[PDB]
């Protein structure tokens, strides 16, 4: 049932939060995570996708599942989105992109005459069991976190 295999380390990175603490995939054992990765904190898609996933935070709850989103912005620039958006779930400050690397999110693209590295916006469903299930890669923030809620539904039934 996994559609991507993670090397076994990356459940065990240290992963810096907002607010200052630290988790690691395998501590979310027992429940469904829902991780997305955007590009930017602040900016109009990625406060957007945020917003949305904010919004449907007690139908996640009811299901049984948390939300992580991730970029590479720092702490500090993660505190400062969370607290002006009132965002309820942590952002994972992935400065040195080993958690983006390892979901192969960090894609390359011919432009400027060159080869240009970037987070691509694309959400992911771990099981309890830590099975990557389902996959959105170069993700349209609109409708996106309904249509997520809705597989994790799909999946945890
Ligand atoms: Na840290
Ligand atoms: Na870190
Ligand atoms: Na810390
Ligand atoms: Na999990
Ligand atoms: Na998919």
């Given at each position: 049932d996994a559609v991507l295999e993670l090397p076994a380390a990356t459940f065990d990175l240290p992963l810096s939060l907002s607010g200052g603490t630290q988790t690691t995939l395998?501590?979310?054992?027992?429940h469904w995570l829902v991780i997305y990765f955007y590009p930017?904190?602040?900016?109009p898609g990625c406060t957007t996708e945020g917003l949305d996933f904010n919004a449907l935070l007690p139908e996640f709850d009811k299901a049984g599942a948390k939300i992580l989103g991730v970029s590479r912005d720092s702490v500090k620039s993660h505190d400062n989105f969370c607290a002006k958006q009132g965002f309820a779930f942590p952002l994972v400050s992935d400065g040195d992109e080993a958690l983006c690397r390892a979901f192969d999110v960090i894609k390359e693209k011919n432009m400027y005459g060159k080869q240009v590295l970037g987070i691509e916006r694309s959400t992911f469903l771990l099981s309890?069991?830590?099975?990557?299930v389902q996959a959105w890669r170069?993700?349209?923030?609109?409708?996106h976190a309904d249509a997520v809620l809705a597989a994790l539904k799909a999946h945890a039934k």
């Open positions: 395998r501590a979310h054992a027992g930017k904190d602040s900016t309890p069991e830590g099975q990557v170069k993700v349209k923030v609109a409708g």
